[PDB]
Symmetry: C3
Subunit: 278 residues, 3 copies
Amino acid sequence: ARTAPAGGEVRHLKMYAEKLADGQMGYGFEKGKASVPGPLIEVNEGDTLHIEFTNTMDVRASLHVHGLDAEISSDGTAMNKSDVEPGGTRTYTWRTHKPGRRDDGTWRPGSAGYWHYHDHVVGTEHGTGGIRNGLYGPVIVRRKGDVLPDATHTIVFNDMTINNRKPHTGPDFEATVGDRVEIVMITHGEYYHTFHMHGHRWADNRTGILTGPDDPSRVIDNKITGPADSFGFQIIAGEGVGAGAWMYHCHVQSHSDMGMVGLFLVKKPDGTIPGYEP
Amino acid sequence: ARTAPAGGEVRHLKMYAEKLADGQMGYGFEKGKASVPGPLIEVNEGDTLHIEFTNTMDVRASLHVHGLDAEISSDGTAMNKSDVEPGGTRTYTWRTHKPGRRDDGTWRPGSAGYWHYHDHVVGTEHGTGGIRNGLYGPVIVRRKGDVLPDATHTIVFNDMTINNRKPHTGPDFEATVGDRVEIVMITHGEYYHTFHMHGHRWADNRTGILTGPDDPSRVIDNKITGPADSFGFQIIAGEGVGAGAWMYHCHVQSHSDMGMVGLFLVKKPDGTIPGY
Amino acid sequence: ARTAPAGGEVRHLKMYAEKLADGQMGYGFEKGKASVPGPLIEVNEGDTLHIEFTNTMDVRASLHVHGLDAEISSDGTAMNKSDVEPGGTRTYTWRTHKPGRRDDGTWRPGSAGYWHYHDHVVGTEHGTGGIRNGLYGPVIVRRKGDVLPDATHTIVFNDMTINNRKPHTGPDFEATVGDRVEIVMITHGEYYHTFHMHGHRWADNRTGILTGPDDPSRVIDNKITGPADSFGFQIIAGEGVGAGAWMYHCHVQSHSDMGMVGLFLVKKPDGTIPGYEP
Ligand SMILES: [Cu+2]
Ligand SMILES: [Cu+2]
Ligand SMILES: [Cu+2]
Ligand SMILES: [Cu+2]
Ligand SMILES: [Cu+2]
Ligand SMILES: [Cu+2]
Ligand SMILES: [Cu+2]
Ligand SMILES: [Cu+2]
Ligand SMILES: [Cu+2]
Ligand SMILES: [Cu+2]
Ligand SMILES: [Cu+2]
Ligand SMILES: [Cu+2]
Ligand SMILES: [O]
Ligand SMILES: [O]
Ligand SMILES: [O]
């Protein structure tokens, strides 16, 4: 549904950090259902979120968030003991706020935007081991009136991989011509990257959408990103270009050649993609 | 000419891909007149552009564009047989659109901006060979009312080179104090860069120009870029700083040291340049 | 106060380039009081600045500035002999200008912004030696109406160091909850970086501050930077998150692991910091 809503609710949520069978580490809302990337958390400006977090691993782990109003006790770092011991359980709290005028007359930003969460404790004091292994996930904070998508996809460039997948695999995403597709794009690790989508483009601002003819933001289909960068956008699938198997990839030449490639499969109403072999 | 116009007309155009005597590969509007970078293509929002493309090389080649409304048949990739056989000829179509309100009440962006075209098939499935050899070129799409420059210069950071030129060989550009100079800045290859100009600055938005006093865009003279990034801007030559041999270079220290340097030569009305 | 008063006044200043005892090279306002980074230079749009520069070193050195209206005679490059001989003295001139309509009806940008000065001559004709040794410093140009901070801190990512300091040695900065803190963020050298601040966020525009509700600039807490990049922002210390030892670091994993970390120490009114022992 378009736009909405007001926002300002208290939200409760359970979350777990698990070591997976393949040696990777992931977050999940349920035990045995962890994923890389971790599950999407979407809230509205003003919402308070209480996360009952449980470390089911044999090493210390934490939950650390970007952009959201988290107190030092919910920082998720080793230094101030806001990380979690093996088998332990801690309640992290993320608050959010609406924009508005301060007493001094200046404008307070508001927490709306495309954010992410990750471990800060596994491997090193900066979560190098955790992030490498897959302990990361997307967070979206919505402002009142923000356009809502048909579906949201998370693309994370972690080191030389997309979503910790083996080279030249996925992820591939499906859509029908006209679908409002939202992309959350996060980067992690050592390397700078350049995200690129074939046949689609977005505004380089907060939402990825231009508000009106007054917005001077650059319209792009290619964007440089570094570790811990997060941005997002919405596109109309196949808008002005029609159905097809539209590539997305890192445009760093050796990166794309070594398998940092996926497909945005845009289908006709009848379900066919020209000219693609399933 | 300053400002405008509307669009869009239907444009027809011929383009060729050639192996050069250097060993490099270039695009051109005519056989024997290929260049690195390839020729500039400038259109207005709304224009439809039909390119009669001919691959004169012994390997498969393609034409792939950023930003413009090109259908999957004009994607220029091997994956869906959109590339071209040796000796072959294919018609690529690029469409452009004005911004406007969608039926749902949201705002559709529009094609206007600084874009680029390149090969997607030579060397690898991603045109690593073609791009390295020089198969790249600039594309400008104008919005109705966009300020038009006196001249347009294309600077491409390809790997450790500028426009595939040997270290410490420019290119250099000339202008007179007061000339409205447009720069199209494209990056290709493996490495990140920082584009920098002495004595000049621009807005970090679509046009490179601030619309008015309400535009909050950062005014910059230094910008980080990665492979396939493209941006552009207009500057008034020598504005507030006067004539001179103004350096432009990548600011990555070893890059500038190893030859990623050129000169923006701004002359007095009499033709002289202070210093130099 | 609160806001910038508008220039332009003619300002005179003395500056020295010294080789320090430890082997580093620094700028200073007084002979013997050189620092890395060099001293902050803050002016208002319209101001003219005359810098009486003296090279006290045994090699050639220069003063080169970003963003400000400097003539070719004040470029500070070997090319046009605007660098300074050992023991020599040269008067550099930096001018600034307000935005306005040109004769042709277009809008001229104006000098306002976060800028930097550095050497262009030591080591190579691009100042690679000087910059590595520490010859760099911040420059701020204010526009009329610009919100003034309580304090300004300079964070320079020079190669694998912050402000040429040894790994894991800060620098740390102190503030009290509610203080308007300004950060000037400059990058130099060979490497790309990602600047990140725990518990704080800013707008990705000229001032780092949103003008009003109409500003579409992305609100971020993480930003990719390359050599010679400069940006700045203002934050309300501990806003929405309270006091604490808030971490700042380059988010490139090996960089933070190898010492590119510091602390933004936000104190309670009573001077205590939760979960932090001194
Ligand atoms: Cu951190
Ligand atoms: Cu990459
Ligand atoms: Cu492409
Ligand atoms: Cu982080
Ligand atoms: Cu591609
Ligand atoms: Cu470079
Ligand atoms: Cu410079
Ligand atoms: Cu491309
Ligand atoms: Cu320079
Ligand atoms: Cu770094
Ligand atoms: Cu963090
Ligand atoms: Cu510089
Ligand atoms: O972090
Ligand atoms: O591409
Ligand atoms: O520079």
